[PDB]
Ligand binder design. Sequence first.
Ligand SMILES: O=C(Cc1cccs1)N[C@H](B(O)O)c1cccc(C(=O)O)c1
Ligand SMILES: O=C(Cc1cccs1)N[C@H](B(O)O)c1cccc(C(=O)O)c1
Length: 263
Amino acid sequence: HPETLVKVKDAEDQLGARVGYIELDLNSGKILESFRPEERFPMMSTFKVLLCGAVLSRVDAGQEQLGRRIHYSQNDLVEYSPVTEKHLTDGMTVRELCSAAITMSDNTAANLLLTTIGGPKELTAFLHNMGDHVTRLDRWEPELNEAIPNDERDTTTPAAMATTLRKLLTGELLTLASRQQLIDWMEADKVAGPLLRSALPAGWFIADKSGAGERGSRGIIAALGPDGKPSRIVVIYTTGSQATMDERNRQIAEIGASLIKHW
Ligand SMILES: O=C(Cc1cccs1)N[C@H](B(O)O)c1cccc(C(=O)O)c1
Ligand SMILES: O=C(Cc1cccs1)N[C@H](B(O)O)c1cccc(C(=O)O)c1
């Protein structure tokens, strides 16, 4: 909607940095609204949803099992691993790892899952093999959040990410069961409260994944809609701002308020 675009442009100015935005109809896949849709931005933690989509693809192919248990040591732990740091003795199953990666943005969970598929290069291969020739993961957590200007490593574009997210959640690439599990993990996201969720009215559905990185990078991908079901996909990214986390969160929440108001 025009008013949401106004807010996206406001945000870009107030933050003094680029903001990327796109809104897709979930059923048709058509672009409803956009700003800098083809420009690159660091994915940050939003890649974790793509990673679990690759894992679910392997589950569908019989090459992986959600109940398989993965053991690891203190040597595998990296920063921001609130869930995995509590399970060094018992380990965690693949589904528990996807749940921790998506709902808590657990970094070690993401690295362990990347190991199951062969690393960043194999996640990029998975993306290329499903039609996304733009998105690329090059590094592991936490280095993938470096966000060096003009560096294309670990980046996506709002349009490629929204298109890929839609493919993972709808269609046939993944089985009905896997599509439902992926969106259920996103619905249970626990760490994106200050973003789109802050402006969400009671009764609305939201399945999301946020991201934060160096050099003011911040973003979120989501499937949301009124009456408890999603009907649109929204992707928002920004990088380069000197603004505080609170201000970057507020700008994204205000884009959300506009999206909701003019739905
Ligand atoms: O671990 C990091 C690195 C940094 C997070 C904040 C400044 S640098 N980022 C991940 B993810 O974007 O790669 C992360 C960790 C915890 C919460 C979030 C979030 O989405 O808020 C994101
Ligand atoms: O070196 C950087 C790179 C960054 C880009 C976005 C957040 S930090 N920023 C410094 B700083 O936060 O110490 C900075 C501070 C004030 C103004 C500028 C500028 O580029 O004008 C740059």
